[PDB]
Design a protein around this ligand. Structure first.
Ligand SMILES: NC(=O)C1=CN([C@@H]2O[C@H](COP(=O)(O)OP(=O)(O)OC[C@H]3O[C@@H](n4cnc5c(N)ncnc54)[C@H](O)[C@@H]3O)[C@@H](O)[C@H]2O)C=CC1
Ligand SMILES: NC(=O)C1=CN([C@@H]2O[C@H](COP(=O)(O)OP(=O)(O)OC[C@H]3O[C@@H](n4cnc5c(N)ncnc54)[C@H](O)[C@@H]3O)[C@@H](O)[C@H]2O)C=CC1
Ligand SMILES: NC(=O)C1=CN([C@@H]2O[C@H](COP(=O)(O)OP(=O)(O)OC[C@H]3O[C@@H](n4cnc5c(N)ncnc54)[C@H](O)[C@@H]3O)[C@@H](O)[C@H]2O)C=CC1
Ligand SMILES: NC(=O)C1=CN([C@@H]2O[C@H](COP(=O)(O)OP(=O)(O)OC[C@H]3O[C@@H](n4cnc5c(N)ncnc54)[C@H](O)[C@@H]3O)[C@@H](O)[C@H]2O)C=CC1
Lengths: 371, 371, 371, 371
């Protein structure tokens, strides 16, 4: 089949959905790869590098979309991409539908087959394609939090790890999953006092073991959450129920009680945000004021470190890309229950139950379109 | 005596040279404290907080300078402050004269007694007043380096500590002193691969012990330095001979061989900078391009975290402030050889030998004006 | 000469001032060793073990004191021992005179040569004979603090290191010296949140390095001390100016603001105690209430672990014992400036300056009785 | 339904089975909560705090028992509570029936529905309601062991972590589960030399990884066990087969070979004890001599740190409490196989197989009374 990779068009989205090695593996298996010129330049993969690997370098975005049977993107389609979505085409990318009705509508109306990176889930309930992006996001969250805590950035003017004799930043991380563990670890590495909350005690028990008590763990009860946030120089929001709109855990009213110049980073923004006052920002304009605090809500965080994130992503996605290309979406999903869990849309039907309940929209069973 | 503390006027300089507790201790010992209104507002010390402690809150900068017997600043005097410097007044602040002729000339022409925070040196050769600022600078260097390595900041687009399976940033720190140790430690905390160079093997042996080999140490030979730099995603410049103009260790020619998008942070900028292509920058305009790299050269780095740095600084300086105010500069310097080593100017005479050799200007013996 | 070691008679004092190996080394050098029967039974050194090594096992305490030229004790003489002190005898033991007038008076009236373990001081200002006892005391402080924080002991009923999800004990250690470093280290080992204060920034910088920021360090300003204490579940008092009465750093008024059931351990009790409400307690009756808190003030803490402390002590003291016995106090002190600094009393003369100022009693120069 | 929480009456039992937040969540779901006055005072939850949350504060224990449909306790019923057990009432608490026939008899004769915290078991075989109590018990075991090792407590008089130059305590932990891992970790934190034995090599492999070899691991063969114990200053007994009477692993005969003053802490005492010579003690009288050793056998260890343990417990139990209250025991157990595994007694029938074999008493299948 034809596998197409367009240039990413989201704000400051420098990643790409495939690397030369993946292009070379596709063409070894007798597949046709088409790639928009420049598509990899943000990740420092040239058109030449792609050409060498076996790719057909095309001049226009509209051509890739129209030709490609399997389409590989990093981010969700945006407004100007809605007109590109076809029928009988397989879209494989991050989707975050629970967070956007306007996007979900487009995939349904065009009737395209779509599977979502972020809902591919292995038997043990782990999400192996979101994982490395959560990894990148958690780590960015800490340094980005550190940076915006500088007075010069409008923030409070506390240094992350203090210096001997002078107290370090107080960091609160909500969620002990991949993103939250990774944020806590970097922030702790910067010398910050870190507290992680979660409703899953096992997650905290893991964190208690790994850092031998150096990262504080609190059960995410209303009482403990409120107290932590009221105290925090920096709050990082990192919760998730797989493929569901984030719950609202930090109210605007709570934010009014916070230290002036506190920074809040809502990693969960891509799935709705878990702060009441969050709204999607972009790398160009990353922050906005709420009360006396600074909010940071970039939905494509990994985008600023494409050398790292492009390879982190594609290391994980390729085995799944190969199976789609080799066997087609129906057979691939039939042979892989983890791939199947990612099925989002097919011919005007929404195949995720969770996303159907969050949007208030008709759900149809996945196993029903797999026979 | 009268002890005056003006508002800082350097770019984004949010620090102050005294805190309430210091004001309170001065007034217990029967001293008169005068403070420019707003002088502490950047460090979140109100005029009221200062009032409460025993300070006379004055409306203008020109009055403090004119009244104050002992004058306490954080940074060196700048152009618009040159007209404030008097005779028979003691100036106590960061000076960095080896790096500025125009500043040094002003102190000599005004005929003012000046001691420099950064050349106060104990018996073991440590600089206990520079120390905490080096601590803050080192730690800022790492996070600031992390931030500017993001593609969105023009940098290379590598994440500091990578993510599992994908290589972390390569960080090279030149100098194993206070700043460099602290830079290495935060950088290493962020998951970066860190290499520290120094011409003092002892310093590296300390670093090798503390992190049990996790921070790489290389003897700063021409060979090892050039190889480290050529390989680095981020170079942090942190060298010092006490009170002397920095040596030029990284040539512009070397920088041309570096990875495009590499960031270079010259902590040593305040003492001339140890990169050949360095020039003083500010928090407003922190970075300039040199070849295909990005340079960061802020001479007052600690300014962005006054909540941390103001207290770090004043924790250290007060015991010395008290001795100056209690006994006057001549007796204080006679009783404290560590205070003495800070003597810079008195009545048109330059009293530091090193600063005299770096500027090519007449040196006069300190012990000669102390009798 | 004759070297005598009495049984310790202080409350629960299970230590002894010599071990078999030390007895054996004394007798090799042609010295006569006399030891009160049972003197080592608390440290599990039998009369037989002592016999075997070369000691004359004597039946009574009064005989040892009367015969012995050099007398080796662990603790200071107590009331019933005051009648034992002779002229021309060298007493070598812990003294803590700055804290007891009635003890100091006894040494002056008896006219005895006395050197104090705890004021023997090397060139770098370290106290190598107090050191290991501070080590034992610091480590005891943490576990003893842990134990008395249990509700069943009257304390607050918080567990030292919490458990995942639930906050650990908040421990505040005042002083970053030997005792305080060791207290902080064990406490932190137990999972407690530890904060160390000190007026010597260097000491905190060492602590910040060693535990890589995991033990919090605060500069011991009035502001920071009061805030730490008000917050602490357990405060450990560990300050010292060599051989001087402890300064009073925690007032009774402050203690009234503390969490009910907080425990306070004043390691410094032996030198006066650094808590205002402290008074010497014993192992039998270790704790008294002050306000809604519980105080622990045992002046001979190491006594409860003689198997550890006896050898810790004697490991350190022997080289000094040998020099005393070999050359006599006058020649030994002339050849060792570190031994010299321990001189306390000789023939009715108080030879420590600091102890003279704390007691308000006539001081006489050490070097004057060494010629 | 009515959910009742009596005051705990066991020796020094300061915990409570519910906290305000849990009371508030129950009353939100339309349930009636009754709480014996004073029931929470040991955990510092006032009657007022409970009232505010929505609880009906009742004066007497007999009323709660009689009214409550779901009854929440921390510990097992004791002699004076046997007369309180009703029919058609759900008891939810720690039970430890394999260890007490007299208790098991009462639940059977009264015919009460009972589920046990300690046998609630998730699919992966983990016991999530015992877990946090094992956590608390392990950590207490180490400090309690440290304390009783002091000479003054009758113990051997070795300090846990020694001091430089002098050997630390030798600690042997039998069982690498939750309690044993937590004991080893605290003891290691105190500087003790720790050895953990287990018949499950994976458990030891986990411990070998976490502490990177610093905690010694030995396969719990007869040979290795004997040798460790013979050498130990402190032995902590921490084994378990879920809901079964502990195996006897340390014979009285072995104890005769041990160092005099050695302390043995049998955490497993609540399930019979794994030391041959153990017998239930209480916080009032915690220890008894066996041979030349000191045994410590408190069955309600977590009781002395109720601030920690009450919240540790209820954090875990509440989700299960809510399900019982919402749906009743039959439906709740039907929807939750982990809840179901806790079923102990119903209408005169013993529903645990393990407890039936240990007691030698008729077992009846759980699934049989769930239809
Ligand atoms: N902005 C960006 O560029 C990126 C955002 N993300 C987002 O980060 C979020 C976290 O992702 P992961 O860490 O992989 O998920 P995860 O499942 O690894 O972690 C989420 C954790 O939050 C906890 N949690 C759920 N509900 C909670 C509540 N009410 N209170 C407290 N804790 C709660 C869960 O127990 C879970 O462990 C996701 O929403 C993901 O979409 C991920 C990558 C990049
Ligand atoms: N930008 C800012 O805001 C601040 C800048 N600084 C600057 O940071 C610099 C370093 O300060 P500290 O770490 O306190 O000094 P330090 O003395 O602690 O460390 C400097 C180290 O550089 C080493 N060094 C000297 N010559 C060298 C050579 N040719 N090659 C390799 N290594 C060499 C020395 O051996 C020494 O260990 C100073 O120039 C200081 O003024 C300090 C504080 C703030
Ligand atoms: N109860 C017992 O059985 C024992 C008690 N001790 C006592 O422990 C105390 C501490 O001993 P070490 O740790 O060896 O002394 P050290 O000299 O190692 O440490 C004392 C520390 O307290 C600091 N300090 C002094 N004044 C201060 C102030 N105003 N505020 C804050 N910090 C201040 C010093 O800078 C020093 O670092 C001594 O009084 C000693 O006699 C020692 C052994 C046993
Ligand atoms: N006294 C108190 O207050 C408390 C007592 N406990 C008791 O602590 C005990 C341990 O509990 P957990 O650590 O949660 O159980 P666990 O299952 O986490 O740990 C027990 C470990 O012992 C090992 N083991 C079993 N048989 C063995 C044998 N013959 N030789 C060597 N190792 C063996 C198992 O492999 C298991 O890993 C339980 O009996 C529990 O009831 C728990 C909490 C409080």
């Amino acid at each position: 089949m034809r596998v197409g990779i367009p240039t990413e068009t989201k704000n400051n989205e420098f990643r790409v959905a495939i690397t030369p090695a993946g292009v070379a593996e596709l063409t070894r298996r007798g597949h046709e790869v088409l790639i928009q010129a420049g598509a990899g330049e943000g990740s420092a993969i040239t058109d030449a590098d792609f050409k060498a690997a076996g790719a057909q370098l095309v001049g226009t975005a509209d051509q890739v979309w129209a030709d490609a049977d399997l389409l590989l993107k990093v981010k969700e389609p945006i407004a100007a991409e809605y007109g590109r979505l076809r029928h009988g085409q397989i879209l494989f990318t991050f989707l975050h539908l629970a967070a956007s009705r306007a996007c979900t509508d487009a995939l349904l109306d065009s009737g395209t087959t779509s599977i979502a990176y972020e809902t591919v889930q292995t038997a043990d309930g782990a999400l192996p394609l979101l994982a490395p992006m959560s990894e990148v996001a958690g780590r960015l969250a800490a340094q980005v939090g550190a940076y915006h805590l500088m007075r010069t950035q409008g923030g409070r003017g506390v240094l992350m790890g203090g210096v001997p004799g002078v107290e370090p930043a107080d960091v609160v991380v909500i969620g002990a999953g991949t993103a939250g563990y990774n944020a806590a670890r970097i922030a702790n590495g910067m010398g910050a006092t870190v507290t992680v909350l979660d409703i899953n005690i096992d997650k905290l028990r893991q964190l208690d073991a790994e850092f031998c008590g150096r990262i504080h763990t609190r059960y995410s009860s209303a009482y403990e959450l409120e107290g932590a946030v009221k105290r925090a120089d920096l709050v990082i929001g990192a919760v998730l129920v797989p493929g569901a709109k984030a719950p609202k855990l930090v109210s605007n009213s709570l934010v009014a009680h916070m230290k002036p110049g506190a920074v809040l980073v809502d990693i969960a923004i891509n799935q709705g945000g878990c702060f009441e006052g969050s709204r999607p920002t972009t790398y160009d304009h990353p922050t906005f004021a709420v009360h006396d605090t600074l909010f940071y809500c970039v939905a494509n965080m990994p985008a600023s470190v494409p050398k790292t994130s492009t390879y982190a992503l594609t290391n994980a996605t390729m085995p799944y890309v190969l199976e789609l290309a080799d066997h087609g979406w129906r057979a691939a999903c039939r042979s892989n229950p983890a791939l199947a869990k990612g099925l989002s849309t097919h011919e005007g039907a929404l195949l995720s139950e969770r996303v159907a309940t969050d949007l208030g929209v008709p759900f149809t069973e996945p196993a029903s379109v797999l026979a």
